[PDB]
Design an enzyme around this catalytic site. Structure first.
Site, mmCIF file in Angstrom:
data_model
loop_
_atom_site.group_PDB
_atom_site.id
_atom_site.type_symbol
_atom_site.label_atom_id
_atom_site.label_comp_id
_atom_site.label_asym_id
_atom_site.label_seq_id
_atom_site.Cartn_x
_atom_site.Cartn_y
_atom_site.Cartn_z
ATOM 1 N N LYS A 98 33.209 43.025 27.507
ATOM 2 C CA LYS A 98 33.783 44.356 27.469
ATOM 3 C C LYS A 98 33.100 45.247 28.502
ATOM 4 O O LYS A 98 31.878 45.248 28.620
ATOM 5 C CB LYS A 98 33.602 44.977 26.081
ATOM 6 C CG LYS A 98 34.285 46.325 25.935
ATOM 7 C CD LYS A 98 35.775 46.151 25.717
ATOM 8 C CE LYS A 98 36.520 47.468 25.816
ATOM 9 N NZ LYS A 98 36.615 47.902 27.232
ATOM 10 N N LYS A 185 49.301 38.506 21.573
ATOM 11 C CA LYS A 185 48.655 38.896 20.330
ATOM 12 C C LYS A 185 49.778 38.836 19.302
ATOM 13 O O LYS A 185 50.775 39.547 19.423
ATOM 14 C CB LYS A 185 48.072 40.303 20.447
ATOM 15 C CG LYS A 185 46.873 40.356 21.381
ATOM 16 C CD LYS A 185 46.326 41.762 21.523
ATOM 17 C CE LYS A 185 45.172 41.773 22.502
ATOM 18 N NZ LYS A 185 45.598 41.251 23.828
#
Length: 294
Positions: A98, A185
């Site tokens: 991240k 997703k």
């Protein structure tokens, strides 16, 4: 209710802006489904999240073509030292780092922890403008990036970034030359079957990621990965580690870099510990269901 229960689970650290994962678990004929859209999504958007929950709870998923799925480690925006420990403890050879939540130092640390043969991908969550994306990717490029996920917020931006960098970009998107890889997703896409159709229609290689769900939601993500033609990229389904707790006695935690393809059993004791009054969530679910059916 007996068949619709809401939960609130704190994450171990802030990730993609959130620190608490909330949602509902719904029990159907096929088992349990998870409906956990993030707060900002309106009913029309949540409609697909509900469709995924409904599929998991009432319809079941397409049969798998593999019994396990490879997963990558998800490294939040923590110190470089902590990032390395997360990777070294992950059991995975691919790691997503991240950034834009010390970004360069974190990626460097992860590459170091993985060694030359590891794969490193970057999660930007659309936080950069085109020019910032180009300069940051260039700075991170010396660590050999598998790909950079959603560097910018829109397709037009992704397209410009793609023209100026030499690393694959993960996000029609192909017709706009905006991506090299498409991220799937299960919840936001409307379920495993819907995601499988998109995988074919998008005309690009795909990778499966999660929406940081409990094991109930992750089981659907694993079913998707287990039904896809192939998995050239490790799946971002090892995110249960980002949560402080789960709703199952046998949580979907990776071992040796893979997750087993199996349904999960919700545990009364576990769910009760993180359960909340479902009133507000039931109202939200009702609005999403209404949007879906209409």
């Amino acid at each position: 209710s007996l068949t619709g229960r809401a939960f609130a689970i704190p994450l171990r650290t802030r990730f993609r802006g959130i620190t608490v994962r909330e949602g509902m678990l719904v029990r159907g004929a096929a088992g349990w489904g998870e409906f956990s859209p993030f707060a900002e999504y309106g009913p029309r958007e949540c409609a697909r999240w509900w469709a995924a929950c409904y599929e998991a709870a009432e319809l079941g998923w397409p049969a798998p073509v593999r019994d396990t799925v490879p997963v990558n480690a998800t490294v939040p925006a923590v110190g470089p030292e902590e990032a390395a420990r997360i990777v070294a403890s992950s059991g995975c050879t691919t790691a997503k780092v991240k950034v834009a939540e010390n970004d360069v130092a974190r990626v460097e640390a992860v590459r170091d922890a993985l060694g030359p043969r590891g794969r490193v991908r970057i999660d930007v969550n659309g936080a950069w403008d085109v020019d910032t994306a180009v300069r940051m990717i260039r700075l991170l490029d010396r660590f050999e990036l598998e790909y950079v996920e959603q560097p910018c917020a829109t397709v037009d931006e992704l397209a410009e970034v793609r023209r100026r960098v030499s690393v694959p970009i993960a996000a029609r998107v192909r017709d706009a030359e905006a991506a090299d890889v498409v991220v799937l997703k299960v919840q936001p896409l409307g379920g495993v079957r819907a995601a499988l159709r998109l995988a074919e229609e998008c005309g690009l290689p795909v990778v499966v990621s999660s929406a940081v769900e409990t094991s109930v939601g992750l089981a659907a993500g694993v079913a998707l990965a287990a039904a896809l033609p192939e998995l050239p990229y490790a799946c971002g389904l090892a995110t249960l580690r980002l949560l402080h707790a789960d709703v199952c006695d046998d949580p979907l935690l990776p071992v040796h870099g893979v997750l087993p393809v199996r349904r999960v059993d919700v545990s009364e004791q576990r769910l009760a510990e993180v359960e909340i009054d479902p009133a507000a969530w039931q109202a939200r679910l009702a609005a999403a269901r209404a949007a879906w059916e209409q």
